[PDB]
Design a protein around this ligand. Structure first.
Ligand SMILES: C/C(=C/C=C/[C@@H](C)C(=O)O)[C@H]1CN[C@H](C(=O)O)[C@H]1CC(=O)O
Ligand SMILES: C/C(=C/C=C/[C@@H](C)C(=O)O)[C@H]1CN[C@H](C(=O)O)[C@H]1CC(=O)O
Lengths: 248, 253
């Protein structure tokens, strides 16, 4: 049986291929996740239809506790797998089963080069330089729930003034960093990608936490473990590292 | 019901406490893993008896496909959990269920300071400097199964001459590095611990792979997921990071 794979567009994980004529099916996409997906499909032996998540969201829960995006697709069994830079979080792992991480990363700071700023603490102590994150993303949630003083303070600032310091998506954040005096709290894997394509930007400090991206499956899914094992196999033989180098 | 926790002695994960009189039970140990364990027990609400694995091995399989150590304890249901720097590997994950990693790391190089060597490649190209790893550990296995040229070459050297380049345990490896012209392939978390207490030693290059340590449970265990969720919780609130700092920090160099 063909597995339905729910995903979302995000450089360089899942992107529309470049072609002179209209593309159809899986042929529409390319990227690290499509490469990962075909590696997993060879190892486990399954066919799949990549399908973009209808609402274009990763998955968060509203005030009433209902989920949206890819997480929701898995919960309602509208998809068998979720392959994308879907951060393994406490709140998400309770409603869906994650495979072991296929990429590890952390929350860090994207800012422009040649400045005295060097840590999340430097930012927390002032207000001249504005800073924030993608609204409702795992990074924002981290700062929202943290009880570490420095992070509590930063959240106080990010959420103030109607969350004007937050951005809707990564691209809006990057442009905001390139144009104004703004710093973006962003996942390290994404910062590496960006700083490699824009010499004006750089990472500030190191990681302020350790996270991973995993393949999502519905709770009780028989593939969860098979995928985990395949990921470990791909990691141990250098394929994951090879794939990262290819797209980064 | 009290859960039986199988573990092994390894600084600074599980160590014998220092005391004037004989110690008994869980009171015998201290370390990062005992701290982790009590955090998990508070969150999940269970009691536990720490018990050192009888044969003192982590878990590898012999030629007949038989497992030993902690992995074996879990397979035969002699323990409910395995809490130790037990590397999550392909071969192990097939016989036991692992929680999500509570610590991520990689294979790196422990060598002495002030030398021209700077990468696994530098080592692979020569033979003056001897190098190896703990025999039968996950690191050795990595090199044994790799098909990457540089690692294939290093394995060729490590396994040659009856594996004389390999060591029985981390301490033998560290002493060998401090005394002779030898480099030790070792997990990054352990290198950090050592270099912080030995200003003569240092890490060479970065990580040559990405691994994690996880709590082990028997296949089909009802705790696997509960523990995973608790670990994510502890990570998200800074406790795992806090615990690492508590046991890793040295006295400066
Ligand atoms: C790039 C990104 C955007 C998320 C946007 C959310 C608000 C959504 O549209 O559902 C994701 C990638 N991984 C994080 C997550 O899974 O939450 C998030 C980025 C981040 O939060 O740093
Ligand atoms: C310090 C260590 C010693 C393992 C010794 C094996 C040969 C044993 O006696 O069971 C462990 C720590 N994590 C690895 C593992 O889980 O296999 C191994 C060290 C390593 O292989 O680099």
């Amino acid at each position: 049986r063909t597995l339905i794979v729910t995903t979302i567009l995000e450089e360089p994980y899942v992107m529309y291929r470049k072609s002179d004529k209209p593309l159809y099916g899986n042929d529409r996409f390319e990227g690290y996740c499509l490469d990962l997906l075909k590696e997993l499909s060879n190892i486990l032996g399954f066919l799949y239809d990549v399908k973009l998540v209808p609402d274009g969201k990763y998955g968060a829960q509203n005030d009433k506790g209902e989920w949206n995006g890819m997480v929701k697709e898995l919960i309602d069994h509208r998809a068998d797998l979720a392959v994308a830079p879907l951060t393994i979080t406490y709140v998400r792992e309770k409603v869906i089963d994650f495979s072991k991480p296929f990429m590890t990363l952390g929350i860090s700071i994207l800012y422009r080069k040649g400045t005295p700023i060097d840590s999340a603490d430097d930012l927390a102590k002032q207000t001249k330089i504005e800073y924030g994150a993608v609204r409702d993303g795992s990074t924002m949630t981290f700062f929202k729930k943290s009880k570490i003083s420095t992070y509590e303070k930063m959240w106080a600032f990010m959420s103030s003034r109607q969350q004007s310091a937050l951005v809707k998506n990564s691209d809006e954040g990057i442009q905001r960093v390139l144009t104004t005096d703004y710093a973006l709290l962003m996942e390290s894997t994404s910062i590496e990608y960006v700083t490699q394509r824009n010499c004006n930007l750089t990472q500030i400090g190191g990681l302020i936490d350790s996270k991973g991206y995993g393949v999502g499956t519905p709770i009780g899914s028989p593939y969860r473990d098979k995928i985990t094992i395949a990921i470990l196999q791909l990691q141990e033989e250098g394929k994951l590292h090879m794939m990262k180098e290819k797209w980064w």
